[PDB]
RNA sequence: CGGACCAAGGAGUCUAACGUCUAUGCGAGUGUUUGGGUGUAAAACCCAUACGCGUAAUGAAAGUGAACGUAGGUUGGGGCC
RNA sequence: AUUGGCGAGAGACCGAUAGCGAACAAGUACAGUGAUGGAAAGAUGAAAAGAACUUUGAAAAGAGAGUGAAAAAGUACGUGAAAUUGUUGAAAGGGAAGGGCAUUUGAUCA
């Protein structure tokens, strides 16, 4: 039920990773800019890893847009689900990981009755 | 431990980075350095001119 | 004039008595000053701590 | 009497209620006033139509 | 590549939108922005620009200043418009009746105006009375009257009030100010 | 809250006092409520536990079981009640310790000191 | 405070806002006001003239109570009287009845001539009076009395 | 040391002022103690002022 | 040149007196919290005199101490008529 | 006035590599003839209910059985990562591995 929107395009789908993160275990995969004077990445030599810049910004119209075309909204209870009544065509319901299955099934039933898309319907459900 | 003594390189570029402004010209420049007798003449002349202007129309 | 606010009895039902407003509610509302003064005063009730 | 009024004393040393820097809290009514509307020029078309 | 002849992405240098979080002043700024946008009168633009000045940029103005402004012929019917705080001045004894519009009024100045018979209004009342600023006069206080200004641009052979907490004998009056003690400035 | 300037509301101080309370303090700390019938009979809400006091379990997995008290372990802050225990795999019987506050005093051993305490606390017997 | 400090933004940067060629060595040149005449002489002679040398004679046991000379002008002369009576005194410019001002009682010792008071008689009591102020007060109609 | 256009400051802190420095965190407590002492003195010295 | 690896800890913080800028409050005045009363009790509220800075500066000092006027004339000058 | 002693009330303080050197048999073990220096060490489980009994093994122990809400809680005991190692599964390997640009193939995915 997503509104007609421009095709989702991503300039850089690959996740940016820190230099030598695979080489050394103490270096986490979280990106950190290299400030060394003789840093190859900072000097931007040919054949290096990509550096995050202002050019990689996604389209504003498609910003925070899921592939299904519905924005993700975190839901905590029935009252929180009520927030997505008159905006269901442009939003999606997501259930927090702190929610027990007993209340999860009630929230799922409420969303089904109210016509609200659920990001993770099969969460903490018996299978 | 020899070092460079004097070098004029990049000085002209540093000076030209900001526009070399001409000194500001005013309608009435400072009367310093002029003859003191001429200054007294100036003071008396404007005193008389102001008195005449006030007499004609205040 | 200024609005007359009805006074409710202890039983929970408003009576016929009416009173003028206390001439403060017309003061300007300044959230910035309110927040600044509240933050400043909230530090007054504090206990000093220091490592030996 | 405790906090003062427009006629009674404020019961405080040289204290007066703060003055309002703007007469009314609503500016839409000021905009809609006839004197302002007569002086203001006719409006446009909100979002300008794209040309060329 | 473009051979830039000037700094790119250079800020205009003029403060847009007030820095203060005053909600009432923000509403006044919005009202005057709308007035300047919809009217060609430069008075609205001048008032909007003056509303953006800082505390040190909006010096205070004593009642004697508006008294002198009214003393000029043709300004008796003019309604003064000062962007700042009007302060009481005890030097002036007789205050002619007039209309004064300012953001803030001192208690003494307001009492003096009321006693003299003049009227005091706020900026929005002034705007609704005269949307185009008809028969209005703009008053500004002395900008360089601040005590910090006298210390500005201190240098040799300038005499620009050198910064010192305690003045008097032996405090910044030794060699450097007297010809007998070495030299003078 | 607290209006007195001498009592302590600190959790650390309260826990320290409870854990290091001597035998005399533990005697009054280990108190059990009385039954409804016994409360109607004496007019006393609660009394300190005793070795020869009949008690009935009101909370826990042993609900409904009643018996006499074999011994009160003030060191362990508990009281042992006979005729209710768990059987070990070795074949021996080990008593199960339980808090006195989880019991309802069905009957108590009346003595001279006990009767004096009843009169001091305002009993009718 | 801590959140708004530039140190948090400097986090990550190697030099932390202190440069690379010249490190932030504690007390690089001198300490306090060291070298006021050797290597800081340029700043001493350009920004703080008159720092070095003697000025005049020495006055031992300088008691500031002796040099208690508060001043006021004719413009503020009328401000001492409360307005409730000041307005009617201004309205009634009468010689036989004039307001009396005690500058000493308000903490002002010397009378200075500035303000051009209106032509209303007024009696003023002060320890010291200036020539111009006395002439102006005499011309206004009132007289000045010296009390101590 | 010497810096830009800043007034000369004469701060006497060369000595070990950290060892000998007093801070009054006890203002309210000592005020309450003084009030209690005044009340008990009024009680002790009889209706005498 | 330091670096075998990993985990934990790790470095422009605070005080006294200030310079520029900004915000708030009052305004030729300004600062309750030295202290007293009051208090639901280190919280909050109220208050008299004093004192810090400014309103007058220049001299080593004895001392003196700012309208000939529409608080002056002229140039440039936003706004207003 | 009070970094000593005793009896008390609190913290926008700290949390077992923090906080006093010491939360535990801490000025203890220990080192130096000597004056002195000076640590590491908190947590099973509500309740030991601490694994009866059978089998293999000399025994330490292993496997069944049982207590236990949980033995993925066994007096090496709350929760249980990396550096390092073993088993199973997948992939690559003519004097390095690791990375970036794009794609084929395999696995996997809304």
Nearest to E102 by CA among E81, E88, E130: E81
Dump the DSSP string for chain G.
-TTTSHHHHHTT-SSTTS-SSS---SSSS-SSSTTTTTTSHHHHHHHSTT-SS--S---TT--TTTT---EE-HHHHTTSS-HHHHHHHHH---SSS--EEEHHHHT--EE---S---S---EEEESEE-HHHHHHHHHHT--EEE--
Q: How far, in Å, are D8, D30, E88, E101, H20 from residue E105 at the CA level? A: 21, 22, 9, 9, 50
F5-17 CB burial, b ≥16 within 10 A, e <16: eeeeeeeeeeeee
- DSSP code of F100? G
Alpha helices in F30-123 (DSSP H): 36-42, 112-121
- CA of A23, C1' of J99: distance in angstroms: 10
Is residue E105 classed exposed, middle or buried when 0-12, 13-18 and 19+ CB atoms within 10 A define those classes?
buried
Contact F102, F84 (CB under 8 A): no
Give the separation between CA E109 and CA E66, rounded to whole angstroms: 11
Give the separation between CA A22 and CA E39, rounded to whole angstroms: 64
Token pair recorded at residue G18: 């202190």
Give the separation between CA B42 and CA G23, rounded to whole angstroms: 61
Q: Do G27 and H1 touch (CB under 8 A)?
A: yes
How many C-beta neighbours within 10 Å does residue A42 have? 15
Residue pointed to by tokens 């209710």: F84
Give the separation between CA F16 and CA G139, rounded to whole angstroms: 89
E-strand stretches of chain F = 31-33, 46-48, 54-57, 66-67, 69-73, 78-87, 93-98, 103-107
Contact E122, E100 (CB under 8 A): no
Is there contact between G125 and strand I, defined as CB under 7 Å from any strand atom?
no
Query: Which chains reach chain E with 3 or more Cβ–Cβ distances below 8 angstroms?
Result: C, D, G, H
Cα end-to-end distance, chain B, whole Å: 78
The rounded Cα E170 to chain-centroid distance in angstroms is 38
- Give the helix/strand (H/E) hosting H45: none
Give the separation between CA E136 and CA E78, rounded to whole angstroms: 5
| Chain J nucleotides covered by protein, CB below 7 Å | 1-3, 8-13, 19-20, 46-52, 66-67, 82-83, 97-101, 110
Contact F94, F15 (CB under 8 A): no
Q: Do H5 and E151 touch (CB under 8 A)?
A: yes
Q: How far, in Å, are B6, E155, G94 from residue G133 at the CA level? A: 66, 38, 20
Radius of gyration of chain H (CA): 23
**Nearest nucleotide over every DNA/RNA strand to the E67 CA, judged by C1':** I70
Q: Using an 8 Å CB-CB cutoff, list chain H residues near E154.
A: 5
- Give the helix/strand (H/E) hosting E105: strand E104-105
Choose, out of A32, A35, A36, A38, the residue to mutate when testing the contact with G (most G CBs < 10 Å).
A35
E-strand stretches of A28-83 = 71-75
Token pair recorded at residue D34: 């006839």
Contacts of E32 (CB under 8 A, 6+ apart): E44, E47, E48, E51, E123, E127
How many C-beta neighbours within 10 Å does residue G23 have? 9
- DSSP code of F50? -
Nearest to D18 by CA among E60, E99, E113, E106: E106
Give the separation between CA B39 and CA B47, rounded to whole angstroms: 12
Question: Measured between CB atoms, does G13 come within 8 Å of chain A?
Answer: yes
Nearest to F115 by CA among F105, F107, F123: F123
Contact A2, A11 (CB under 8 A): no
Give the separation between CA E33 and CA E38, rounded to whole angstroms: 9
Give the separation between CA E115 and CA E88, rounded to whole angstroms: 13
Dump the DSSP string for E67-104.
HHHHHSTT-SSPEEEESSEEE--SS-------EEE-SE
| Chain I nucleotides covered by protein, CB below 7 Å | 5-7, 12-14, 16-30, 33-39, 41-44, 46-48, 50, 55-58, 60-62, 64-67, 69-76, 78-81
Angle at E150 between CA E147 and CA E154, to 5 degrees: 140
Contact G98, G123 (CB under 8 A): yes
User: Looking at CA atoms only, how far is residue E182 from chain G in angstroms?
Assistant: 10
**Nearest nucleotide over every DNA/RNA strand to the E60 CA, judged by C1':** I27
E62-84 CB burial, b ≥16 within 10 A, e <16: bbbbbbebbeeeebeebbbbbbb
Q: How far, in Å, are C28, E167, F29, G48, G71 from residue C4 at the CA level? A: 20, 61, 60, 67, 54
Q: How far, in Å, are A121, E161, E178, E179, F36 from residue E183 at the CA level? A: 90, 18, 6, 4, 107
Token pair recorded at residue E176: 């450097």
Contact G101, G123 (CB under 8 A): yes
Contact D32, D25 (CB under 8 A): no
Residue pointed to by tokens 């490190």: G23
Q: Using an 8 Å CB-CB cutoff, list chain E residues near G78.
A: 90
């Amino acid at each position: 039920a997503s509104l007609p929107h421009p095709k989702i395009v991503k300039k850089h789908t690959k996740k940016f990773k820190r230099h030598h993160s695979d080489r050394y275990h103490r270096v986490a995969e979280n990106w950190r800019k290299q400030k060394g004077i003789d840093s190859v990445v900072r000097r931007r030599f040919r054949g290096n890893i990509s550096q995050p810049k202002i050019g990689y910004g996604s389209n504003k119209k498609t910003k925070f847009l899921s592939p299904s075309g519905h924005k993700t909204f975190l839901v905590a209870n029935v009252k929180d689900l009520e927030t997505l009544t008159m905006h269901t065509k442009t939003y999606a319901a997501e259930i927090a990981h702190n929610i027990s299955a007993k209340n999860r099934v009630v929230i799922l039933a409420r969303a089904k009755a109210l016509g609200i898309k659920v990001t993770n319907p099969k969460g903490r459900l018996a299978l | 431990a020899k070092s460079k003594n004097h070098t004029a390189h990049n000085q002209t570029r540093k000076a030209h980075r900001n526009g070399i402004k001409k000194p500001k010209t005013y309608k009435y420049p400072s009367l310093k350095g002029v003859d003191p007798k001429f200054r007294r003449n100036h003071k008396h002349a404007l005193h008389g001119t102001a008195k005449a202007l006030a007499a004609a129309k205040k | 004039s200024r609005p007359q606010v009805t006074v409710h009895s202890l039983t929970g039902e408003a009576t016929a008595n009416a009173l003028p407003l206390p001439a403060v509610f017309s003061a300007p509302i300044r959230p910035d000053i309110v927040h600044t003064v509240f933050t400043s005063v909230n530090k007054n009730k504090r206990q000093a701590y220091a490592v030996s | 009497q405790v906090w003062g009024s427009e006629t009674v004393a404020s019961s405080k040393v040289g204290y007066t209620l703060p003055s309002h820097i703007i007469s009314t809290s609503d500016v839409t009514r000021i905009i809609n006033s006839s004197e302002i509307q007569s002086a203001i020029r006719p409006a446009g078309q909100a979002t300008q139509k794209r040309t060329h | 590549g473009i051979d830039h002849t000037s700094k790119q992405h250079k800020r205009s240098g003029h403060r847009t939108a007030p820095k203060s979080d005053n909600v009432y002043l923000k509403l006044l700024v919005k009202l005057y922005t709308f007035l300047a946008r919809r009217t060609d009168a430069p008075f609205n633009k001048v008032v909007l620009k003056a509303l953006f000045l800082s505390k040190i940029n909006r010096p205070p103005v004593s009642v004697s200043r508006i008294a002198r402004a009214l003393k000029q012929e043709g300004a008796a019917n003019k309604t003064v418009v000062v962007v700042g705080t009007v302060t009481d001045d005890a030097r002036i004894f007789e205050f002619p009746k007039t209309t004064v519009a300012a953001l803030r009024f001192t208690a003494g100045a307001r009492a003096k105006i009321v006693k003299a018979g003049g009227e005091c209004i706020t900026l929005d009342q002034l705007a609704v009375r005269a949307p185009k600023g008809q028969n209005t006069l703009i008053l500004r206080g002395p900008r360089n009257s601040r005590e910090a200004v006298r210390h500005f641009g201190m240098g040799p052979h300038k005499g620009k009030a050198p910064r010192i907490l305690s003045t008097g004998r032996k405090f910044e009056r030794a060699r450097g100010r007297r010809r007998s003690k070495g030299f003078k400035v | 809250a607290k209006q007195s300037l001498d009592v302590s509301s600190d959790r650390r101080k309260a826990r320290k006092a409870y854990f290091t309370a001597p035998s005399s303090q533990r005697r009054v700390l280990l108190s059990a409520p009385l039954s409804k019938e016994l409360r109607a009979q004496y007019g006393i809400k609660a009394l300190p536990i005793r070795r020869d006091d009949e008690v009935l379990v009101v909370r826990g997995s042993k609900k409904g079981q009643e018996g006499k008290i074999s011994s009160v372990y003030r060191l362990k802050f508990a009281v042992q009640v006979d005729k209710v225990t768990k059987e070990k795999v070795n074949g021996a019987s080990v008593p199960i310790n339980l808090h006195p506050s989880k019991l309802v005093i069905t009957k108590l051993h009346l003595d001279k000191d006990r009767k004096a305490l009843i009169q001091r606390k305002g009993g009718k017997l | 405070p801590s959140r708004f400090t530039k140190t948090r933004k400097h986090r990550g940067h190697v030099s932390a806002g202190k440069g690379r060629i010249g490190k932030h060595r504690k007390h690089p040149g001198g300490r306090g006001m060291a070298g006021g005449q050797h290597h800081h002489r340029i700043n001493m002679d350009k920004y703080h003239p008159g720092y070095f040398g003697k000025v005049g004679m020495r006055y031992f046991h300088k008691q500031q109570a002796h040099f208690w000379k508060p001043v006021l002008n004719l413009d503020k002369l009328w401000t001492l009287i409360p307005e409730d009576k000041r307005d009617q005194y201004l309205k009634s410019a009468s010689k036989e009845t004039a307001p009396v001002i005690d500058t000493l009682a308000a903490g002002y010792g010397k009378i200075l001539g500035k303000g051009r008071i209106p032509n209303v008689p007024v009696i003023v009591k002060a320890r010291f009076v200036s020539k111009l102020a006395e002439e102006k007060i005499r011309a206004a109609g009132g007289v000045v009395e010296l009390i101590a | 040391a010497i810096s830009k256009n800043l007034p000369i400051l004469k701060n006497h802190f060369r000595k070990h002022w950290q060892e000998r420095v007093k801070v009054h965190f006890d203002q309210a407590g000592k005020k309450v103690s003084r009030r209690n002492a005044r009340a008990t003195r009024a009680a002790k010295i009889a209706p005498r002022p």
